[PDB]
């Protein structure tokens, strides 16, 4: 039950306009052969060009929307659209390219897919709203066969070159002309009513329809992300490490302990309303504050309404401070400590999402509602600072003397930062800059002032 059986039925009603007379009874085995490919009875790791809904979710980083529109069927040009926004015109002789024969179009496709996916996934999953021409055009730039490894490394092969008769992954595909062993999935097979635009526009207002192939490719992938990461959520699926996931997660927990501990020392809140992950633990377990938890799973569609979270416990969320660490609400109260992911940040962990949101894949997949500046009108941006009440003692690196107005320590209060707190300062600054560059923003109540922390050294 792992892979999609090649004898599974395939609904061809969406194909009968480009391909009139197509059989109603159709399997993937008869469809792959129809597309011009031969499986030759194979058990070499490539059982089907099409993958399941579950298998596609585990390879979401490889999703590339793909659509082909008749520009004017072997006798007419074809407009190739990809969710990267690229439009290629192939002739049988937001960016748009002029018409060119297939032998040079396939070279651009290998280059475009490789630069997109080399730091993301080991494969490519062509997300389709299939109507005919996109399946029949793959024979001009897709070659299938047994699973192979790269000729320059041990990654699996994703490209093939007719010049050298060799194979390569996304990293070493310069000069290659064919996509080797790709995967694909037809969203239209999931049982929708209506066309692509009517179904996409039910949940997203950001992607329009300029009647170009790439617009449909973007809407197709967007509709797929909504069905797999907005309407349905699966937090049990783990995703491989492809970047600084571990340092970013560790930096977020390092900053959270620093910020919440300092806010409790500076303002002496009697109560703390920790609103967010239902499995959360005290990030400052040594604090005197009364810690009250409120369960709320990460929202994947729209940001929570602060009215429905609070108003319907201590119930007096105006007492003490409220902690919204990656708990996206529409408008945070004035007595809040907030960590909110910026969906606009470009990174290999953050994928384009639905209706302004993004899909942040770090160990797990979190579809995050679109970043809204108006949510922080009652708060201010949290400035960088480093606080430490630990003993100014170095145990165990080369020391350039540290001078910083944001090093809240006894040694800095005394006019000279010690080597221990200087190491921890520069380590915390690296973690802070790691967290901010990853896309997380920090916000705090306007009364927060690091000048109140100097007095805890008395
Ligand atoms: C809720 N949320 C978080 N972020 C961010 O996304 C990343 C995923 O981290 P994560 O939540 O997968 O794990 P940690 O917090 O490191 O786990 P931890 O504190 O360790 O809690 C225990 C869990 O982690 C596991 N775990 C515990 N210790 C470790 C460890 O040392 N290493 C690893 N790899 N896992 C550990 C443990 O088995 C359990 O699954 C982080 O940057 C989050 O801030 C969000 N970002 C967006 N856009 N939207 C969200 O809704 C959102
Ligand atoms: Zn390679
Ligand atoms: Zn959309
Ligand atoms: Zn010190």
Measured in angstroms, how far is the CA atom of residue 400 from the centroid of ligand 4? Answer: 14
Q: How many CA atoms lie within 13 A of 269 on its CB side?
A: 27
Look up residue 383 and give its DSSP letter.
-
Query: Could you give phi then psi for residue 327, rounded to 5 degrees?
Result: -115, 95
Facing residues of 101 across strands?
A: 91
Q: Does 274 belong to an annotated binding site?
A: yes
Alpha-carbon 166 to chain mean position? 32
Alpha helices, DSSP H, located in 44-123 = 53-58, 102-117
Ligand 1 contacts CB of residue 176 (under 6 A): no
SS3 label, residue 364: strand
Facing residues of 368 across strands?
A: 358
Residue 150 · residue 15 · CB < 8 Å: no
Ligand 1 contacts CB of residue 362 (under 6 A): yes
Residue 228 · residue 60 · CB < 8 Å: yes
Of 360, 368, 436, 439, best ligand 1 pocket probe by most atoms within 8 Å of the beta carbon: 360
Structure tokens at 307: 């009215």
The DSSP secondary structure of 118-152, one letter per residue, reads TTT-SS-EEEE---SHHHHTGGGTEE--S--B-SS
Name the experimental technique: X-ray
Q: Does 438 belong to an annotated binding site?
A: no
Query: What residues are labeled active site?
Result: 67, 69, 134, 211, 216
Q: Report the C-alpha gap between 103 and 177 in whole angstroms.
A: 8
- The H or E element that residue 4 is part of is none
Ligand 1 contacts CB of residue 341 (under 6 A): yes
Look up residue 8 and give its DSSP letter.
S
Query: What sign does the dihedral 207-212-214-220 (CA atoms) show?
Result: positive
Measured in angstroms, how far is the CA atom of residue 200 from the centroid of ligand 3? Answer: 6
Q: What residue's CA is closest to ligand 1, atom 21?
A: 280
Look up residue 156 and give its DSSP letter.
B
Q: Report the C-alpha gap between 114 and 174 in whole angstroms.
A: 9
Which whole-number Å values give the CA distances from 14 to 35, 64, 183, 287, 330, in the listed order? 16, 20, 20, 61, 39
Q: Does 339 belong to an annotated binding site?
A: no
Ligand 1 contacts CB of residue 360 (under 6 A): yes
Residues 6 or more apart whose CB falls under 8 angstroms from that of 356 comprise 206, 343, 369, 370, 371
Residue 357 · residue 368 · CB < 8 Å: yes
Alpha-carbon 100 to chain mean position? 33
| The pairing of beta strand 440-445 with beta strand 379-381 | antiparallel
Measured in angstroms, how far is the CA atom of residue 205 from the centroid of ligand 3? Answer: 6
Q: Report the C-alpha gap between 18 and 167 in whole angstroms.
A: 33
Which whole-number Å values give the CA distances from 139 to 37, 63, 135, 413, in the listed order? 7, 20, 8, 71
Q: What residue's CA is closest to ligand 1, atom 43?
A: 249
Query: Could you give phi then psi for residue 256, rounded to 5 degrees?
Result: -60, -45
Residues 6 or more apart whose CB falls under 8 angstroms from that of 210 comprise none
Alpha-carbon 329 to chain mean position? 20
Ligand 1 contacts CB of residue 189 (under 6 A): no
Measured in angstroms, how far is the CA atom of residue 413 from the centroid of ligand 4? Answer: 9
Q: At what angle do helices 245-267 and 419-437 cross, to 10 degrees?
A: 110
Q: Report the C-alpha gap between 352 and 51 in whole angstroms.
A: 21
Residue 231 · residue 199 · CB < 8 Å: no
Task: Kindly list the domain boundaries of the chain, sorted by start residue.
Answer: 13-145+182-230, 245-456
Q: Report the C-alpha gap between 331 and 315 in whole angstroms.
A: 17
Structure tokens at 215: 């617009």
Q: Report the C-alpha gap between 343 and 300 in whole angstroms.
A: 12
């Amino acid at each position: 039950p792992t892979h999609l059986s090649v004898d599974t039925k395939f609904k061809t009603e969406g194909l009968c306009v480009d391909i009139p007379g197509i059989p109603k009874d159709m399997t993937y085995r008869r469809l792959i052969s129809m597309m011009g490919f031969k499986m030759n009875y194979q058990v070499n790791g490539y059982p089907n060009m099409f993958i399941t809904r579950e298998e596609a979710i585990r390879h979401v980083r490889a999703w590339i929307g793909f659509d082909v529109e008749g520009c004017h069927g072997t006798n007419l040009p074809l407009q190739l659209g990809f969710s990267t926004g690229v439009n290629l015109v192939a002739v049988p002789t937001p960016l748009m390219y002029k018409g060119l024969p297939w032998n040079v179009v396939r070279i651009k496709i290998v280059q475009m897919l490789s630069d997109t996916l080399k730091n993301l996934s080991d494969r490519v999953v062509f997300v389709l709203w299939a109507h005919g021409f996109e399946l029949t055009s793959m024979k001009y730039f897709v070659k299938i066969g047994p699973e192979r490894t790269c000729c320059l490394c041990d990654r699996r092969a994703t490209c093939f070159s007719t010049a050298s008769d060799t194979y390569a992954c996304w990293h070493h595909s310069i000069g290659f002309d064919y996509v080797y062993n790709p995967f694909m999935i037809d969203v239209q097979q999931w049982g929708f009513t209506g066309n692509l635009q009517s179904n996409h526009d039910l949940y997203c207002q950001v992607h329009g329809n300029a009647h170009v192939a790439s617009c449909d490719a973007i809407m197709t992938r967007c509709l797929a992300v909504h069905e797999c990461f907005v309407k349905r959520v699966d937090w049990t699926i783990e995703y491989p490490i492809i970047g600084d996931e571990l340092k970013i997660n560790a930096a977020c927990r390092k900053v959270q302990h620093m910020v919440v501990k300092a806010a409790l020392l500076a303002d002496k809140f009697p109560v703390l309303h920790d609103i967010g992950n239902p499995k959360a633990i005290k990030c400052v377990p040594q604090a005197d504050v009364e810690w009250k938890f409120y369960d709320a799973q990460p929202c994947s569609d729209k940001a929570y309404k602060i009215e429905e979270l609070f108003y319907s416990h201590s119930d007096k969320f105006t007492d003490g401070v409220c902690l919204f660490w990656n708990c996206n609400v529409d408008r945070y109260p004035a007595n809040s400590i907030v960590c909110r992911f910026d969906t606009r940040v470009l990174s290999n962990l953050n994928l384009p999402g639905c209706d302004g949101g993004s899909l942040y894949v770090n160990k797990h997949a979190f579809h995050t509602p679109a970043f809204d500046k108006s949510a922080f009108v009652n708060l201010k941006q949290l400035p960088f600072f480093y606080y430490s009440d630990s003993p100014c003692e170095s145990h165990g690196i080369d020391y350039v003397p540290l001078k910083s107005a944001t090093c809240i320590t006894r040694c800095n209060l005394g006019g000279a930062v010690c080597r221990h707190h200087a190491n921890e300062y520069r380590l915390y600054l690296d973690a802070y800059n790691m967290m901010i560059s990853a896309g997380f923003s920090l916000w705090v109540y306007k009364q927060f002032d690091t000048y109140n922390l100097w007095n805890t050294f008395t």
